């Protein structure tokens, strides 16, 4: 009924010995887009050209962290488990409310209109593109008491050649052409979905380096030939050659069991504006150039953080485009002079696994050697997966997403979004919700031409999302104290984590999840 | 104003031919296209490229 | 001498894509031949006129 | 073949060089595609499916 709410506002986590059950809701606002008409996309610029469709339709997306847990929880969470990984969630939305506004000159009026009706259907078949997924604003603010904006639906088409435009290839998605429920106050819409076996994400820093796992005590019953000849001097000495017994000590030299890193370079720079070369966003030699590109069908796509590699402390002068670079409180515009200003995610914790973003892989014998010509190593910058290569994915971030959609192809190689988070094959679906459209008064004798006349209206209702997350507790052995999150924050005017007198709330810090320790 | 909503149930029957050589078929094999076919454009405006019947397949006497 | 027979039972899936536009696919398309292709001929020889993939149906990633 | 017995066979070409034998017996292959399948078949198959894989296989001579 018009009179009945159809749903609770419940905010809650429930933590268990084995699971925790996060759950939260939020009030959200629907306008009506591009005047109720799908709309042809398309740019051709050189290293960005994109084509496309801009729909009717709005989504709601939860794949930020922060959505489903209070900083406290975030906390509880990192400082007293090994790994987490989703299990299973349900969404409903309720308390619909369709406005509509009689705008009339200089005031514009809102009113109910109580029989008007907006449509929800979300798509378990997976057959729209999922969008949900990746590197977007419009997931739930972290805030409970933050109301916000549903996100316009758009979606990508394929582009060929450096030029944007459509081959027969390109297809055109209609979201009318699917079933979607009908409702109007007093009415709900529910569903629910079951994540899928997944790997435990890790949540904790390795206490020992790759490179040595052996007791420091012994030493190898393997020989490595240490000298060609004698003297510290490089060419010059006695001829001969010597053998030794690798012994306690030489442990660069120990032959190991396994090799640390899959690994892209990717060009380092200076916090310090002075420490750079100079160079500009424009023109022949953009930066663009200079970073590590990844060339796909005639243009270059800037690889995003890349295949997990170690990366500098977030303190640290000198940052790469491996990690990932977050707003952070203080800064105002779109743009920034300052990275002081800026907040930096950063991996050093996995240092101990795989090889340094700035850094190289290693160096190869790239020569064979003779006692005439001198030997070369070449220095590695890529390197594809080996046989006995361990490495350790990027980190999970309070503020990181959750999940992206593994691509329908093929073949896919350890599926771990690189942007962080778990990779599925049956991603929790998009929902979709449009405000069904509305007709002015309409002219009395018959014309064929569709109807372009539409009564302005919004709408706007609460969502509610709970997920069940399966985690594992740490159960370490180790002996001295563990590093935890704590605030650590000084004495502050207004404290953090917390709306000020403005009324703003801002995020202080980003935070990773690997704070607890285990070795190899 | 409202919704109305038409169901139809059509009974078809597949072709079985016993031709060898592949048919002719419908496929839209436009060219390049600034604004592809078929489908809304940047106006936001739909209409139909072309007419199309239903005779592709083929059938002996 | 004598003939051989294979019979292989081959599993597939279907569609079912939501894609609005007309997809693309094959056809012969080919133009007023003297003797038509995909067939024997006057001399009585067979050969394959073109070399035909499997990927024209569409479906996004 | 071969009168009946098996050959040795080998050639040393620097970029080429191969060692191996000759046998007196023969065999059946149906590894192409098309020995199976008229052209209309691949045609039907590949304009309505999106993938397929093998499934069962007999043979009689
Ligand atoms: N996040 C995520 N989603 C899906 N699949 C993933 C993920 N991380 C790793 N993998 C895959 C990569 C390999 O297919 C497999 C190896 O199992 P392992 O047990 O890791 O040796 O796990």
Redesign the pocket.
């Known amino acids: 009924g018009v009179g009945n709410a159809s749903g609770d506002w419940h905010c809650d986590s429930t933590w268990s010995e084995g699971k925790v059950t996060t759950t939260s809701t939020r009030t959200w606002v629907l306008p009506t887009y591009n005047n109720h008409l799908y709309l042809r996309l398309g740019t051709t610029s050189n290293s960005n050209t994109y084509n496309g469709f801009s729909t009717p339709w709005g989504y709601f997306d939860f794949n930020r962290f922060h959505c489903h847990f209070s900083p406290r929880d975030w906390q509880r969470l990192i400082n007293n488990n090994w790994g987490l990984r989703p299990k299973a969630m349900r969404v409903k939305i309720f308390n619909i409310q369709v406005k509509e506004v009689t705008t009339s000159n200089g005031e514009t009026t809102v009113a109910n209109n109580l029989t008007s009706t907006v449509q929800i259907f979300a798509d378990s078949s997976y057959e729209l593109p999922y969008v949900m997924d990746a590197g977007q604003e419009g997931s739930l603010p972290p805030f409970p008491n933050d109301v916000f904006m549903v996100p316009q639906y758009g979606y990508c088409g394929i582009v060929t050649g450096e030029n944007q435009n459509q081959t027969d290839r390109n297809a055109f998605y209609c979201l009318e052409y699917f079933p979607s429920q009908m409702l109007r106050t007093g009415n709900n819409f529910e569903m629910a979905y079951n994540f899928e076996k ?2 435990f994400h890790s949540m904790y820093a390795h206490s020992q380096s790759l490179d040595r796992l052996m007791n420091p005590l012994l030493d190898q019953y393997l020989w490595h030939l240490q000298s060609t000849t004698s003297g510290e001097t490089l060419n010059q000495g006695n001829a001969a050659t010597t053998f030794g017994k690798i012994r306690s000590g030489d442990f660069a030299f120990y032959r190991k069991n396994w090799l640390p890193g899959p690994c892209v370079k990717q060009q380092r720079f200076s916090k310090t504006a002075s420490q750079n070369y100079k160079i500009p966003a424009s023109g022949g030699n953009a930066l663009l150039k200079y970073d590590t590109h990844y060339t796909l069908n005639n243009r270059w796509s800037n690889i995003a953080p890349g295949p997990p590699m170690a990366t500098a402390g977030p303190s640290d002068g000198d940052f790469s485009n491996a990690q990932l670079i977050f707003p952070g409180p203080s800064v105002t515009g779109n743009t920034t002079t300052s990275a002081n200003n800026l907040l930096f995610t950063s991996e050093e914790e996995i240092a101990a696994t795989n090889p340094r973003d700035t850094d190289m892989f290693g160096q190869i014998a790239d020569n064979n050697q003779n006692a005439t010509t001198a030997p070369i190593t070449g220095n590695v910058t890529a390197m594809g997966v080996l046989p006995g290569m361990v490495w350790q ?1 990027r980190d999970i971030y309070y503020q990181g997403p959750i999940w992206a959609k593994i691509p329908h192809a093929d073949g896919h190689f ?3 979004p690189l942007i962080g988070g ?3 094959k049956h991603p929790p679906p998009q929902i979709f919700i449009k405000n069904t459209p509305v007709p002015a008064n309409p002219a009395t004798t018959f014309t064929a031409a569709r109807v372009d006349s539409f009564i302005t209206q919004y709408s706007t209702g609460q969502v509610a999302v709970q997920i069940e997350w399966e985690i594992e507790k740490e159960r370490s052995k180790r002996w001295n104290p563990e590093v935890q999150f704590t605030s650590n924050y000084g004495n502050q005017s207004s404290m953090l984590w917390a709306p000020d007198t403005t009324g703003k709330y801002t995020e202080p810090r980003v935070i990773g999840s690997r704070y607890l320790t285990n070795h190899l």
């Open positions: 997944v790997p994915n350890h599926p771990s778990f990779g599925l």
